[PDB]
Amino acid sequence: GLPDVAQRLMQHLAEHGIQPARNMAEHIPPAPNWPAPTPPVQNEQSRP
Amino acid sequence: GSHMSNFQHIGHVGWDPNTGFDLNNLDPELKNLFDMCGISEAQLKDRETSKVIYDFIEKTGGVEAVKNELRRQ
């Protein structure tokens, strides 16, 4: 996951008009997009 | 006009304005970003192209800055 820094590099090359060698024909950046471990959920708020 | 001679936050890498990035001195964590964008080693050996790319590294504060920026969550 985490593409915002590569997006920042692309936004910087766009100030000079430069293009990547893949020319935006690629898909899915490296590593799984798994959230932070051990998450909680809400209490038994539903009525008896 | 032109930039000031501070040179306090520069990125240590084998880049030169005469040939671009040295592959033997290219950082593997800085390469994470280059590859995510779709950049080839041919673009890294072009003077004018690699001069645009290197600007981003020294701009954030050298290689240790980009090596931390992609490490954020």
Coordinates of N, CA and C in Angstrom, one line a residue:
Chain A
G1 N 0.8 -1.2 0.0 CA 0.0 0.0 0.0 C 0.9 1.3 0.0
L2 N 0.4 2.3 0.7 CA 1.0 3.6 0.9 C 1.6 4.3 -0.4
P3 N 0.8 4.8 -1.3 CA 1.2 5.4 -2.6 C 1.4 6.9 -2.5
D4 N 1.1 7.6 -1.4 CA 1.1 9.1 -1.4 C 2.5 9.7 -1.6
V5 N 3.6 9.1 -1.3 CA 5.0 9.5 -1.5 C 5.4 9.4 -3.0
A6 N 5.0 8.3 -3.6 CA 5.2 8.1 -5.1 C 4.3 9.0 -5.9
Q7 N 3.1 9.3 -5.4 CA 2.2 10.3 -5.9 C 2.9 11.7 -5.8
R8 N 3.5 12.0 -4.7 CA 4.3 13.2 -4.5 C 5.5 13.3 -5.5
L9 N 6.2 12.2 -5.8 CA 7.3 12.2 -6.8 C 6.7 12.5 -8.2
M10 N 5.5 11.9 -8.6 CA 4.8 12.1 -9.8 C 4.4 13.6 -9.9
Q11 N 3.8 14.2 -8.9 CA 3.5 15.6 -8.8 C 4.7 16.5 -9.0
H12 N 5.9 16.1 -8.5 CA 7.1 16.9 -8.7 C 7.6 16.8 -10.2
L13 N 7.6 15.6 -10.8 CA 7.9 15.5 -12.2 C 7.0 16.2 -13.1
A14 N 5.7 16.3 -12.7 CA 4.7 17.1 -13.4 C 5.0 18.6 -13.4
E15 N 5.8 19.2 -12.5 CA 6.2 20.6 -12.6 C 7.2 20.8 -13.7
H16 N 7.9 19.7 -14.2 CA 8.8 19.8 -15.4 C 8.2 19.1 -16.6
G17 N 7.0 18.4 -16.4 CA 6.3 17.7 -17.5 C 6.8 16.3 -17.8
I18 N 7.6 15.7 -17.0 CA 8.3 14.4 -17.2 C 7.2 13.3 -17.1
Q19 N 7.4 12.2 -17.8 CA 6.6 11.0 -17.8 C 7.4 9.7 -17.3
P20 N 6.8 8.7 -16.7 CA 7.4 7.5 -16.4 C 7.5 6.6 -17.6
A21 N 8.5 5.6 -17.6 CA 8.7 4.7 -18.6 C 7.6 3.7 -18.8
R22 N 6.8 3.4 -17.7 CA 5.6 2.6 -17.8 C 4.4 3.4 -18.3
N23 N 4.5 4.7 -18.4 CA 3.5 5.6 -19.0 C 2.1 5.4 -18.4
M24 N 2.0 5.1 -17.0 CA 0.8 4.9 -16.3 C -0.1 3.7 -16.7
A25 N 0.5 2.7 -17.4 CA -0.2 1.5 -17.8 C -0.1 0.3 -16.8
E26 N 0.6 0.6 -15.7 CA 0.8 -0.4 -14.6 C -0.4 -0.4 -13.6
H27 N -0.5 -1.3 -12.7 CA -1.6 -1.4 -11.7 C -1.1 -2.1 -10.4
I28 N -1.6 -1.7 -9.3 CA -1.4 -2.2 -7.9 C 0.0 -2.1 -7.4
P29 N 0.4 -1.1 -6.6 CA 1.7 -1.0 -5.9 C 2.0 -2.1 -4.9
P30 N 3.2 -2.3 -4.5 CA 3.6 -3.5 -3.7 C 3.0 -3.5 -2.3
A31 N 3.2 -4.6 -1.6 CA 2.7 -5.0 -0.3 C 1.1 -5.0 -0.1
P32 N 0.6 -5.9 0.7 CA -0.8 -6.0 1.1 C -1.3 -4.7 1.8
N33 N -2.5 -4.3 1.7 CA -3.1 -3.1 2.3 C -3.7 -3.3 3.6
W34 N -3.2 -4.3 4.4 CA -3.7 -4.7 5.7 C -3.7 -3.6 6.8
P35 N -4.8 -3.2 7.4 CA -4.9 -2.2 8.5 C -4.1 -2.7 9.8
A36 N -3.9 -1.7 10.7 CA -3.2 -1.9 12.0 C -3.9 -3.1 12.8
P37 N -3.1 -4.0 13.4 CA -3.6 -5.2 14.1 C -4.3 -4.9 15.4
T38 N -5.1 -5.9 15.8 CA -5.9 -5.9 17.1 C -7.0 -4.8 17.2
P39 N -7.9 -4.7 16.3 CA -9.0 -3.7 16.3 C -10.2 -4.0 17.2
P40 N -10.9 -3.0 17.8 CA -12.1 -3.2 18.6 C -13.4 -3.0 17.7
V41 N -14.6 -3.4 18.3 CA -15.9 -3.1 17.8 C -16.8 -2.7 19.0
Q42 N -18.0 -2.1 18.7 CA -18.9 -1.5 19.7 C -19.5 -2.5 20.7
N43 N -20.1 -2.0 21.8 CA -20.8 -2.8 22.9 C -22.2 -3.4 22.5
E44 N -22.7 -4.2 23.3 CA -24.1 -4.9 23.2 C -25.3 -3.9 23.3
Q45 N -25.2 -2.7 22.7 CA -26.2 -1.6 22.8 C -27.6 -2.0 22.4
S46 N -27.8 -3.0 21.5 CA -29.2 -3.5 21.1 C -30.0 -3.9 22.4
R47 N -31.3 -3.6 22.3 CA -32.2 -3.9 23.5 C -32.5 -5.4 23.6
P48 N -32.7 -5.9 24.9 CA -33.1 -7.3 25.2 C -34.6 -7.5 24.8
Chain B
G1 N 17.4 35.4 -11.5 CA 17.5 34.9 -10.1 C 18.0 33.5 -10.0
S2 N 18.5 33.1 -8.8 CA 19.0 31.8 -8.5 C 18.9 31.4 -7.0
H3 N 19.1 30.1 -6.6 CA 19.1 29.6 -5.3 C 20.3 30.0 -4.5
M4 N 20.2 30.0 -3.1 CA 21.2 30.4 -2.1 C 22.1 29.2 -1.8
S5 N 23.4 29.4 -1.5 CA 24.4 28.4 -1.3 C 24.4 27.9 0.2
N6 N 23.3 27.5 0.7 CA 23.2 26.8 2.0 C 23.7 25.4 2.0
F7 N 23.1 24.5 1.2 CA 23.5 23.1 0.9 C 23.6 22.3 2.2
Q8 N 22.6 22.4 3.1 CA 22.5 21.9 4.5 C 21.7 20.6 4.6
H9 N 20.8 20.3 3.6 CA 19.9 19.2 3.6 C 19.9 18.4 2.3
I10 N 21.1 18.2 1.8 CA 21.4 17.5 0.5 C 21.4 16.0 0.6
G11 N 20.9 15.3 -0.4 CA 20.9 13.8 -0.5 C 22.1 13.2 -1.0
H12 N 22.8 12.5 -0.2 CA 23.9 11.6 -0.5 C 23.5 10.4 -1.3
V13 N 23.9 10.4 -2.6 CA 23.7 9.3 -3.6 C 24.7 9.6 -4.8
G14 N 25.1 8.6 -5.6 CA 26.0 8.7 -6.7 C 25.5 9.5 -7.9
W15 N 24.7 10.5 -7.8 CA 24.2 11.3 -8.9 C 25.2 12.3 -9.3
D16 N 25.3 12.5 -10.7 CA 26.2 13.6 -11.3 C 25.5 14.2 -12.5
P17 N 25.5 15.5 -12.7 CA 24.8 16.2 -13.8 C 25.3 15.8 -15.2
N18 N 26.4 15.1 -15.3 CA 27.1 14.7 -16.5 C 26.6 13.4 -17.1
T19 N 26.0 12.5 -16.2 CA 25.6 11.1 -16.6 C 24.4 10.7 -15.8
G20 N 23.9 11.4 -14.8 CA 22.8 11.1 -13.9 C 23.1 10.2 -12.8
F21 N 22.2 9.3 -12.3 CA 22.4 8.4 -11.2 C 23.4 7.3 -11.5
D22 N 24.3 7.0 -10.6 CA 25.1 5.8 -10.6 C 24.4 4.6 -10.0
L23 N 24.1 3.6 -10.9 CA 23.3 2.4 -10.4 C 24.0 1.7 -9.2
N24 N 25.4 1.7 -9.2 CA 26.2 1.1 -8.1 C 26.0 1.8 -6.7
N25 N 25.5 3.0 -6.7 CA 25.3 3.8 -5.5 C 23.9 4.3 -5.4
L26 N 22.9 3.7 -6.1 CA 21.5 4.0 -6.0 C 20.9 3.3 -4.8
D27 N 20.3 4.0 -3.9 CA 19.7 3.5 -2.6 C 18.5 2.6 -2.9
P28 N 18.3 1.4 -2.3 CA 17.2 0.5 -2.6 C 15.9 1.0 -2.0
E29 N 15.9 1.8 -0.9 CA 14.7 2.4 -0.4 C 14.3 3.6 -1.3
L30 N 15.2 4.4 -1.7 CA 14.9 5.5 -2.7 C 14.3 4.9 -4.0
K31 N 14.8 3.7 -4.4 CA 14.3 2.9 -5.6 C 12.9 2.5 -5.5
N32 N 12.4 2.3 -4.2 CA 10.9 1.9 -4.0 C 10.0 2.9 -4.7
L33 N 10.3 4.2 -4.5 CA 9.5 5.3 -5.1 C 9.6 5.4 -6.6
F34 N 10.8 5.2 -7.1 CA 11.1 5.3 -8.5 C 10.4 4.2 -9.3
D35 N 10.3 3.0 -8.7 CA 9.6 1.9 -9.3 C 8.1 2.0 -9.2
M36 N 7.6 2.5 -8.1 CA 6.2 2.8 -7.9 C 5.6 3.7 -9.0
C37 N 6.4 4.7 -9.4 CA 6.1 5.7 -10.4 C 6.2 5.1 -11.8
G38 N 6.9 4.0 -12.0 CA 7.1 3.3 -13.3 C 8.4 3.8 -14.1
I39 N 9.4 4.3 -13.4 CA 10.6 4.8 -13.9 C 11.6 3.7 -14.3
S40 N 12.2 3.8 -15.4 CA 13.3 2.8 -15.9 C 14.7 3.4 -15.6
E41 N 15.7 2.5 -15.5 CA 17.1 2.9 -15.3 C 17.6 3.8 -16.5
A42 N 17.0 3.7 -17.7 CA 17.3 4.6 -18.8 C 17.0 6.1 -18.5
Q43 N 15.8 6.3 -17.8 CA 15.4 7.7 -17.3 C 16.4 8.2 -16.3
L44 N 16.9 7.3 -15.4 CA 17.9 7.6 -14.4 C 19.3 7.9 -14.9
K45 N 19.7 7.4 -16.1 CA 20.9 7.8 -16.8 C 20.8 9.0 -17.8
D46 N 19.6 9.5 -18.0 CA 19.5 10.8 -18.8 C 19.8 11.9 -17.9
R47 N 20.6 12.9 -18.3 CA 21.0 14.0 -17.5 C 19.8 14.9 -17.1
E48 N 19.1 15.3 -18.1 CA 17.9 16.3 -17.9 C 16.8 15.6 -17.1
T49 N 16.5 14.4 -17.4 CA 15.4 13.6 -16.6 C 15.9 13.3 -15.2
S50 N 17.1 12.8 -15.0 CA 17.5 12.5 -13.6 C 17.8 13.8 -12.8
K51 N 18.1 14.9 -13.4 CA 18.1 16.2 -12.8 C 16.8 16.7 -12.2
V52 N 15.7 16.3 -12.9 CA 14.3 16.6 -12.4 C 14.0 15.6 -11.2
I53 N 14.3 14.3 -11.4 CA 14.1 13.3 -10.4 C 14.9 13.6 -9.1
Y54 N 16.2 13.9 -9.2 CA 17.0 14.2 -8.0 C 16.6 15.4 -7.2
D55 N 16.0 16.4 -7.9 CA 15.4 17.6 -7.3 C 14.5 17.2 -6.1
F56 N 13.7 16.2 -6.3 CA 12.6 15.8 -5.3 C 13.3 15.3 -4.0
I57 N 14.4 14.6 -4.1 CA 15.2 14.0 -3.0 C 15.8 15.2 -2.2
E58 N 16.6 16.0 -2.8 CA 17.2 17.1 -2.0 C 16.1 18.1 -1.5
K59 N 15.0 18.2 -2.2 CA 13.9 19.1 -1.8 C 13.2 18.6 -0.5
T60 N 12.9 17.4 -0.3 CA 12.4 16.9 1.0 C 13.5 16.9 2.1
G61 N 14.8 16.9 1.8 CA 15.9 17.0 2.7 C 16.9 15.8 2.5
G62 N 17.2 15.4 1.3 CA 18.1 14.3 0.9 C 17.4 12.9 1.0
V63 N 18.3 11.9 0.9 CA 17.8 10.5 0.8 C 17.2 10.0 2.2
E64 N 17.8 10.5 3.3 CA 17.2 10.0 4.6 C 15.8 10.6 4.8
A65 N 15.4 11.7 4.2 CA 14.1 12.2 4.2 C 13.1 11.3 3.4
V66 N 13.4 11.0 2.1 CA 12.5 10.1 1.4 C 12.4 8.7 2.0
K67 N 13.5 8.2 2.5 CA 13.6 6.9 3.3 C 12.7 6.8 4.5
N68 N 12.4 8.0 5.1 CA 11.4 8.2 6.2 C 10.0 8.5 5.7
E69 N 9.9 9.3 4.6 CA 8.6 9.7 4.1 C 7.7 8.5 3.7
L70 N 8.3 7.6 2.9 CA 7.6 6.4 2.6 C 7.4 5.4 3.7
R71 N 8.1 5.5 4.8 CA 8.0 4.7 6.1 C 6.9 5.2 7.0
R72 N 6.3 6.4 6.8 CA 5.1 6.9 7.5 C 3.9 6.1 7.3
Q73 N 2.9 6.2 8.1 CA 1.6 5.4 8.0 C 0.4 6.3 8.4

